[PDB]
Write a protein that binds this ligand. Sequence first.
Ligand code: CL
Ligand code: CL
Ligand code: CL
Ligand code: MG
Ligand code: MG
Ligand code: MG
Ligand code: MG
Ligand code: MG
Ligand code: MG
Lengths: 365, 366
Amino acid sequence: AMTLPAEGEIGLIDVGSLQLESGAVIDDVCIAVQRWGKLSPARDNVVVVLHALTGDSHITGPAGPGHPTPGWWDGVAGPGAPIDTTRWCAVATNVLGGCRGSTGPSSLARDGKPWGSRFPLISIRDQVQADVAALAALGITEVAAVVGGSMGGARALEWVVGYPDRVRAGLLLAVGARATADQIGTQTTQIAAIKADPDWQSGDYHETGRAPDAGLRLARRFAHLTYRGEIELDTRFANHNQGNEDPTAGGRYAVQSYLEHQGDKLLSRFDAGSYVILTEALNSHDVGRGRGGVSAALRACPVPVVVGGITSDRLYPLRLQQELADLLPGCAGLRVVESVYGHDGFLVETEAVGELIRQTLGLAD
Amino acid sequence: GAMTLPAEGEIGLIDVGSLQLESGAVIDDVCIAVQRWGKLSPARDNVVVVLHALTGDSHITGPAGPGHPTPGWWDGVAGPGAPIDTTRWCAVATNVLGGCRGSTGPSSLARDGKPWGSRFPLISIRDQVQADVAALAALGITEVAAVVGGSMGGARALEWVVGYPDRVRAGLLLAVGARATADQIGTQTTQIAAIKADPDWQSGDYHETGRAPDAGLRLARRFAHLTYRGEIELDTRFANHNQGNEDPTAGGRYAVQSYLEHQGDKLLSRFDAGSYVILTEALNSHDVGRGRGGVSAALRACPVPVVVGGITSDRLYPLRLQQELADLLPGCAGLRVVESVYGHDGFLVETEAVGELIRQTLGLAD
Ligand SMILES: [Cl-]
Ligand SMILES: [Cl-]
Ligand SMILES: [Cl-]
Ligand SMILES: [Mg+2]
Ligand SMILES: [Mg+2]
Ligand SMILES: [Mg+2]
Ligand SMILES: [Mg+2]
Ligand SMILES: [Mg+2]
Ligand SMILES: [Mg+2]
């Protein structure tokens, strides 16, 4: 019954208490939402856009006051765009556990203090439950489609599997049916780097004026390597030095300066507690849990879907998307995005990803 | 040089004296630890140098025990009828300059009686080869039959055959590239940053303080171990399963997580954080083309017969790097592909395939 925010603006949707997969109960949850395009009278034209690990609800448009980053899928929603806002209403949330409007470790609880270590562990399924509740509070009980890559693709997968009667189509991009050992390996070690930072303070650094900046930077540097293509990295930087710096005398290599810059950029806009909470959700991703395993769960989902994967992806290798396309009966076949940019192709390959979105919405109309 | 090799299997300490490094910096009183298997020939022309990788040592074969925290890292490679057949060859292995298993490195004591620590100069792969060559010369060995190595040992072997082509008859270059790649430098410099960000790093002078950067070294090793493994095999072995009866939701661990923590603990008990930094910086500086007109010119001008091998599932030194070496080194008859699910670690695990590469190499040396 709540009203959508004005186009482009952030709305804060109270969804109340949620029972979580761990057994924990979290009260007074708030989900930030942005939308583009008008809602149809039947409220049946919503396209939910699901952001990745460090993304937010700002899917398109420039950076500015209230938006540290530009649209992470800039141009995806608009007149004549892949999500054509003359027909569709693009809606994006800030995920549960995030730090740009939705309830997370850095958010203030009802006592005026950050949740901090009081914030419970959440799953991808918990994130979907919270988004579904936020849409329901807005009078939206069915969506035309859900689209997302990376962690967004995991949210989309659990949405189509968990609510097959309430979504007409999905795009699953650069994701797998469950977390893999390699993903869990790098992800748990990323968390360990943050927790080993002496300023982590058991997750309750928020009020102390100290923060685990060194740990968060290291986590992001290792993560960024998993997001890139091996060949393109060497084509861009090789073993060259940064500018006129001398690595044998305290200077940096070019790829090293680049990685340091990636760490600095994240620190300026993202919370370490959110990084930990959301990476834990990645670790527990498993569409098969409680549903008889991965094959049984996918084979029983009748939702039409487009599945896309990136050739050079080193974090979510193409074999994971081939499995999704082979097992989901609503998938006509894997769509292969050839890209040199690795996992990050799901953000950079604007033309190819735009076409996957258009194909997805074709299955929902 | 007229020192003698230690008794077989036993560690010998070779005084090579002061070395002038590629950078121009000088390091005094360098000691190189050595072990060997097999008798030396009267002409001293049957030496096969086995070059260990980042955290290896001179103990290439044999069990663990007193003085040896780890068993032979290429166990079985040297012996009667083995790939290095000690009825014919003398297998010699050093601990690399900058190491922590007998040779001079950051934890060694300098002339002033204090550990080198932050005073240890940055070294290159070429400096490592210079030291090994000097150690052999002190033993009266001026030419070697062959050099063999994988990973950082392959980088040492490559700089040996390119830098001393008249003093080596053949080389095995396994799971290595002509220069460090951007991806390698990326993970390597971040591993170093993790160690240096540890509060107990103490600018590299933690030695003898009672505190050491254990957390940073564990983290660096965990990330490195992932680069050493095969993606599919890791998931076949561990998948997303919990460790034993633990629950990650309630403080437990995932199976692959407990596995990685154990790799960290194992390295901690036998390896020094300062050595990890110095040797990783030598990997960052790896570039056979430097001062030689670039990679193509350097490789095309090296006439040494070589066997080049690469591992199908290697994610750290991808096969394209060994294709490049095999295409440019005129002494290479063609790339040898090692089929393995175990990633870069296949160069340690695929004993049969690697043993055949060594035999091929030694066939080029007689
Ligand atoms: Cl609770
Ligand atoms: Cl190693
Ligand atoms: Cl070149
Ligand atoms: Mg989960
Ligand atoms: Mg399962
Ligand atoms: Mg199918
Ligand atoms: Mg070097
Ligand atoms: Mg160069
Ligand atoms: Mg050739």
